């Protein structure tokens, strides 16, 4: 059974080149076209060029010429993607894809992208590793319903952050919002909890907050 | 290059309802044309391929029609799965572009907001930063305005905002809004206030709090 397996994310100063690996199974590597497409945050996809594993055959766009490298390993079964002189404008998810190979009546264009790897998110920044600061959202007191409270997790860098409350056993009401790009070049998120006012005083309500790529944690207590 | 359009950007349906996406090409790209699937956070996922023909294992509710110029795909019945992105992608002439995607979103009844406001903490004023948050939660449809007001002025350009992905079991979206303000332009004043306009208030709620006075 088939997959394509890429590797992690990165994240790299403007100037400097992304290599992104793709690594095959359930099938011969060698009879099907590799393809690379790559996604920005909230934006649609863009073909960024193919390459026949079984001829080592390549083409890109017009758009990457010079700046795309696709490469492969017959023996390992692995496609490589290389993007060099990145600009923050190059922030994206990186997929490969697979689609029928050579060729029958222009059947490589006839068939699609049919099985996709998980996609590999580059972040192409000047910013550095950075952790994030864990700050309490708390009503002004407990009013004259139902209540809400919060985490804001600030000033952190790269993505992502996973956020959950009380451990985990606090599900219901959650929401964690998409982070934003500050001006400063770090990112900034909120995550609150919608709860009944009758039980504000009666229980603790911490947000856990993870942060790996700094290895960071940090269990935060909200209360009015 | 040849352009995709895609036509409309955002639709808006219930479960069980016909889905009918549009795809404009710019020049002939005669059949070649594919449909995927996206869903957040997830590979797109092959539908259609040359125009018509139905990827292994698709089940028979899409079909798409069209040659040359013009391209429908047709969900024939909505299944709660079904709400995603959708893209076209032409595959005649280089470089095989893609349309802008259609967003097929869920439709039901017009829900009010609730607003909360957050003042920044103690902890945070140590830093020389002030974070103030308002939040919209579980509203329909997604068009909403916020608006920051201190001692009366309105600010404009010095908050962040974003908004949640249409809710697991009731199809509500909620918003987070940050003001951010240095700790000498915060302790200068004295009332904060967040102003929203929705669809299902009559009139425009405002919550504010007074700094120092909580
Ligand atoms: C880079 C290359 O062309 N081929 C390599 C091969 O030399 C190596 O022994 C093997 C083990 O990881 O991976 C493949
Ligand atoms: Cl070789
Ligand atoms: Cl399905
Ligand atoms: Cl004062």
């Known amino acids: 059974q088939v997959q394509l397996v890429q590797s992690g994310a990165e994240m790299k100063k403007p100037g400097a080149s992304v290599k992104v690996s793709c690594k095959t199974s359930?099938?011969?590597?060698?009879?099907?076209?590799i393809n690379w497409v790559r996604q920005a945050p909230g934006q649609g996809l863009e073909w960024m060029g193919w390459?026949?594993?079984?001829?080592?055959?390549?083409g890109y766009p017009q758009k990457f010429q010079g700046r795309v490298t696709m490469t492969r390993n017959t023996s390992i079964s692995t496609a490589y993607m290389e993007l060099s002189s990145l600009r923050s404008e190059d922030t994206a998810v990186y997929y490969c894809?697979?689609?029928?190979?050579?060729?029958?009546?222009?059947?490589?264009?006839?068939?699609?992208?049919?099985?996709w790897g998980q996609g590999t998110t580059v972040t192409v920044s000047s910013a550095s590793t950075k952790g994030p600061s864990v700050f309490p959202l708390a009503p002004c007191s407990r009013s004259t319903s139902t209540a809400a409270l919060g985490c804001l997790v600030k000033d952190y860098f790269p993505e992502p952050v996973t956020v959950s409350w009380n451990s985990g056993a606090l599900t219901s009401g959650v929401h964690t919002f998409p982070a934003v790009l500050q001006s400063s070049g770090l990112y900034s998120l909120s995550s609150v909890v919608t709860v009944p006012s009758s039980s504000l005083g009666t229980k603790t309500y911490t947000c856990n907050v993870d942060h790996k790529p700094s290895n960071t944690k940090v269990d935060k207590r909200v209360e009015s | 290059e040849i352009v995709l359009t895609q036509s409309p950007a955002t639709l808006s349906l219930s479960p069980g309802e016909r889905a009918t996406l549009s795809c404009r090409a710019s020049?002939?790209?005669?059949?070649?044309l594919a449909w995927y699937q996206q869903k957040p956070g997830q590979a797109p996922r092959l539908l259609i391929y040359?125009?018509?023909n139905r990827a292994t294992g698709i089940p028979a509710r899409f079909s798409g029609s069209g040659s040359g110029t013009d391209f429908t795909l047709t969900i024939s019945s909505l299944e709660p799965e079904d709400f995603a992105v959708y893209y076209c992608?032409?595959?005649?002439?280089?470089?095989?572009?893609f349309g802008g995607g259609t967003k097929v979103e869920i439709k039901r009844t017009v829900a009010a907001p609730s607003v909360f406001i957050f003042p920044p903490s103690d902890e945070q004023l140590k830093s020389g930063t002030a974070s103030v948050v308002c939040l919209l939660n579980n509203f329909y449809p997604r068009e909403a305005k916020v608006q920051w007001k201190v001692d009366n002025a309105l600010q404009s350009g010095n908050s962040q905002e974003s908004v949640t992905e249409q809710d697991s079991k009731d199809s509500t979206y909620s918003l987070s809004s940050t003001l951010t303000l240095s700790k000498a332009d915060y302790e200068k004043h004295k009332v904060y206030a967040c102003e929203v306009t929705h669809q299902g208030l009559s009139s425009p709620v405002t919550k504010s709090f007074n700094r120092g006075e909580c």
């Open positions: 894809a697979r689609s029928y190979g050579s060729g029958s009546y222009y059947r490589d264009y006839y068939y699609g992208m049919d099985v």
């Open positions: 359930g099938y011969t590597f060698t009879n099907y076209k």
């Open positions: 390459m026949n594993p079984d001829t080592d055959s390549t």
């Open positions: 020049q002939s790209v005669s059949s070649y």
């Open positions: 040359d125009a018509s």
């Open positions: 992608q032409q595959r005649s002439n280089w470089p095989l572009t």
